Amino acid sequence: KGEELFTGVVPILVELDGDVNGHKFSVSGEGEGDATYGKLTLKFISTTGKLPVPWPTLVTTLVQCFSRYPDHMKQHDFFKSAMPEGYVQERTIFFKDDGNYKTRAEVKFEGDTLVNRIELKGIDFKEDGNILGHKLEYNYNCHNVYIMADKQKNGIKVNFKIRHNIEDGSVQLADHYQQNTPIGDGPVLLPDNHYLCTQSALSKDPNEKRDHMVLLEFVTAAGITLGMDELYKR
Numbered sequence: 001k002g003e004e005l006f007t008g009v010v011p012i013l014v015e016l017d018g019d020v021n022g023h024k025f026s027v028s029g030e031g032e033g034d035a036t037y038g039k040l041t042l043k044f045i046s047t048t049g050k051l052p053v054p055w056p057t058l059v060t061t062l063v064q065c066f067s068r069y070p071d072h073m074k075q076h077d078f079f080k081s082a083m084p085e086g087y088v089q090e091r092t093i094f095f096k097d098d099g100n101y102k103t104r105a106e107v108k109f110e111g112d113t114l115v116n117r118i119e120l121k122g123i124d125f126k127e128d129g130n131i132l133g134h135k136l137e138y139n140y141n142c143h144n145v146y147i148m149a150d151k152q153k154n155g156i157k158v159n160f161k162i163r164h165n166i167e168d169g170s171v172q173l174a175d176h177y178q179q180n181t182p183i184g185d186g187p188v189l190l191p192d193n194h195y196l197c198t199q200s201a202l203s204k205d206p207n208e209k210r211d212h213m214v215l216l217e218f219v220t221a222a223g224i225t226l227g228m229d230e231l232y233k234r
């Protein structure tokens with residue numbers, strides 16, 4: 001029944017409170033999502049100062065309920081099934097040869113708006129590493145987000161790696177260890193193993209004079225085989 005909430009365009013609000021090596025910051029975001037296309041469009045602004053980490057490192061932290069699940073995979077969409085009461089999404093993110101983020105978020109409907117509220121804490125970053133040295137290019141790659149059921153927690157375990165392009169031509173890897181658990185007592189869908197295929201585009205708004213990020217994302221689920229009846233259907 002949660003998926004019925006996503007048949008059209010849904011407004012989104014994102015609120016992040018962060019602390020990285022003691023640098024405190026907050027981010028606010030707004031836009032909309034259209035799960036029929038797996039599409040998200042959002043604008044984020046840094047409320048206080050220049051963001052103390054590079055914008056691309058926050059993309060994953062800043063609503064996988066907007067992924068497009070093809071028809072034959074609808075029974076494996078945990079994210080929508082938990083709505084409207086929502087889910088808790090927690091991550092540890094390990095930046096290779098650098099620090100880590102730990103995040104806890106609640107994703108739920110607040111009226112007709114899908115809201116992602118996050119607390120982020122980062123530690124052990126190197127003052128002249130790629131993160132605190134702001135050596136990441138302002139762009140974003142395509143990824144595979146691997147999802148498995150976690151029966152003990154009535155939720156999911158999610159693991160993937162992000163590749164951040166570095167201005168010297170190298171790559172900064174960020175390994176993501178994620179878990180999601182429903183907030184409500186209602187039944188959820190616990191999926192077979194599968195993955196999301198992602199693509200994100202980062203851009204800027206010349207009229208926005210605050211430090212900011214404009215994001216366009218498309219995400220489709222995959223990794224569950226079509227049955228022969230579906231493959232050969234007329």
Ligand SMILES: [Ca+2]
Binds near residue numbers: 134
């Ligand atoms: Ca910069």
